[PDB]
Design a protein around this nucleic acid. Structure first.
Ligand SMILES: [Mg+2]
Ligand SMILES: [Mg+2]
Lengths: 257, 255
DNA sequence: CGTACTA
DNA sequence: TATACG
């Protein structure tokens, strides 16, 4: 078994759908598709999206309508699916999908964006904390984990185009980058950096300035594995030619069974 | 005393502010201003709006941020300010302001818009019902009432430009007009219709089609009084030259 | 069409 | 620059 996972902040599932999302979905082989920021409730979605031939679909919308929300399409059915950490305020924004595939638990997370206010930045860092405890608790019991999605933070100065300009901007705060440091220090690997040391490798670009054309950008989307499972990751790349969102999709291949 | 009350769906207080709301407010000099669809929380408003020289301000925002909300500016201070009917689902949308001025209670209400879904249309009609019980309970027990704001419904075919086309559109449903009938039947007067019998008199126009230029429009904003208090209403007109919103302001003068 | 929220 | 509800 050589399995394939794609992660992508679509910035509106209905939006990408109108830009031919389904056609690209067939174009690819993905054994599991993780989507962040779908901005919809299942009922609001066209039937052709709700049900894709060969896939079982799961949707976790935010309580607040048309905001946040994550989704998962899968070819192999999961054992179970958890939708929160067990903390009321964190579970209701539709940012969490934890899917048991026996071999590994798959974390599909849309991490909070801090840019908006200092009030919301607090939420982000406490989300991070809630996240670590959760992933650790499961890794502690011996389970392998794959963590994907939009972390809303570039880690190192190489992970974005304008590091010096943005050191005061949320998404590159010292307190934010310090957490990813801590996160990796807890026994988790940035799967992308295992195979690629080059700068200029980004996953998000600003719409406001037509940034993507320059390739001025940020790496905000990551695949992480616990180091114990590190041996089984064959590929970790950035599908940076796929359009339709301010993010591009990212891919992981695992060698299994 | 001759007392002047203006009611207006501003369609975003911040928005009209940027179109010079305060300058009109200054020039018109009303004794009480009632505003609907403020679309803001007090914290989000510029300080120059939050407080105005000579006026005491009250804000009732919806729980849901940047949606609905009503506001009141007043030169006379009230004995009380109730913000709901006592029904959880109706009180959490910032649609209700009831202000005691001794002589009369002032109702500043932003009635729900039904156009969006049948699910929300249910809410509207149940809002109406909650509203009647409330206004009746107060008047039955000897208080005079002034009810102003956006009712989101034209009453009669004269109250809008395209009645036949819109008989299926929410805002002119029979279920809705039947309620205003019931409402008036309960001893309340459409103060505007006391002084003006003419058609073409409207308060809302659609943005989508540049309708206001034609004067294709609907009368959705009303001043109502209980008939016992009817004698004290001197004027009830439509300030239809004041721009900045899809609604225009309406005015009442009392004694 | 236009106001607002959030990214 | 790019979902909601009037
Ligand atoms: Mg986004
Ligand atoms: Mg409006």
């Amino acid at each position: 078994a050589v399995l394939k996972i794609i992660s992508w902040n679509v910035n509106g599932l209905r939006a990408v759908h109108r830009k031919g999302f389904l056609k690209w979905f067939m174009e690819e082989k993905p054994d599991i598709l993780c989507l962040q920021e779908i901005k919809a409730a299942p009922e609001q979605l066209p039937r052709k999206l709700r049900h894709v031939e060969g896939y079982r679909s799961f949707f976790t919308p935010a309580e607040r309508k048309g905001y946040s929300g994550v989704a998962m399409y899968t070819k192999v059915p999961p054992s179970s699916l958890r939708e929160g950490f067990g903390v009321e305020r964190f579970d209701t924004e539709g940012r969490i999908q934890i899917a048991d595939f026996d071999d590994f638990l798959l974390y599909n997370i849309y991490f909070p964006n801090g840019k908006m206010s200092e009030e919301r930045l607090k939420y982000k860092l406490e989300f991070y904390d809630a996240f670590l405890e959760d992933v650790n608790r499961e890794r502690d019991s011996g389970r392998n984990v794959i963590i994907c999605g939009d972390f809303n933070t570039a880690h190192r100065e190489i992970d974005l185009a304008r590091p010096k300009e943005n050191s005061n901007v949320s998404g590159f705060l010292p307190v934010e980058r310090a957490w990813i440091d801590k996160f990796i220090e807890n026994g988790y690997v940035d799967t992308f950096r295992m195979f690629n040391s080059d700068p200029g490798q980004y996953t998000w670009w600003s719409y406001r300035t037509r940034a993507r054309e320059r390739n001025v950008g940020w790496r905000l989307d990551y695949f992480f594995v616990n180091e114990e499972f590190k041996g089984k990751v064959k590929r970790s790349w950035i599908l940076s030619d796929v359009m339709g969102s301010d993010h591009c999709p990212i891919g992981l291949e695992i060698e299994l069974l």
